[PDB]
Amino acid sequence: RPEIVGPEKVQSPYPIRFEGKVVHGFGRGSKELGIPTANISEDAIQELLRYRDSGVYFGYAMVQKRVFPMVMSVGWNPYYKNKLRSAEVHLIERQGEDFYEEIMRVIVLGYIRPELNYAGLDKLIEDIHTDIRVALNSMDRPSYSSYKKDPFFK
Numbered sequence: 001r002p003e004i005v006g007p008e009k010v011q012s013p014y015p016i017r018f019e020g021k022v023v024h025g026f027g028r029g030s031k032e033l034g035i036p037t038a039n040i041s042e043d044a045i046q047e048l049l050r051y052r053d054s055g056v057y058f059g060y061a062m063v064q065k066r067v068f069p070m071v072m073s074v075g076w077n078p079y080y081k082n083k084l085r086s087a088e089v090h091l092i093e094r095q096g097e098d099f100y101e102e103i104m105r106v107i108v109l110g111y112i113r114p115e116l117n118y119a120g121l122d123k124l125i126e127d128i129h130t131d132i133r134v135a136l137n138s139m140d141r142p143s144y145s146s147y148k149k150d151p152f153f154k
């Protein structure tokens, strides 16, 4: 796996901008597993991500008026046969209280990788850490970092 992904400059279809409310998941205490992920309300991503690749994306996101680099996993709801998109976001290097029922604004800037067949907790944790390291490296580039001041965040 490379330590950086995507073109030097943001390229279509990015940036993809959207907002959704942070709601609970199913019970996977990610927060305690040291890798807290915020589930986005399903109503906000159904049509928008329906034809986008499942996997891990990166970009910026804002909640409680603060902006953070982030990674986002996009998959399908396993509880229903009717294809239902799901998206969960992890704000990178954030310190603060929880933000359930809060509106998060997201700006997707690039794709990291497709979803891997679940191979256990340890592996999942490793992949997330690598994803974070790659996200930060990828947004170190000017064309990307400038979106941290995008009007959508104003």
Ligand SMILES: Nc1ncnc2c1ncn2[C@@H]1O[C@H](COP(=O)(O)OP(=O)(O)O)[C@@H](O)[C@H]1O
Pocket (backbone or CB within 6 Å): 022, 023, 024, 025, 026, 027, 028, 029, 030, 031, 032, 036, 037, 038, 039, 089, 090, 091, 092, 093, 094, 096, 097, 098, 099, 100
């Ligand atoms: N950096 C962060 N990124 C994403 N969510 C965070 C972050 N820090 C705190 N949280 C909180 O962690 C929650 C998810 O963890 P958790 O409370 O254990 O619920 P779950 O069991 O569904 O994972 C989010 O809904 C959010 O309010």
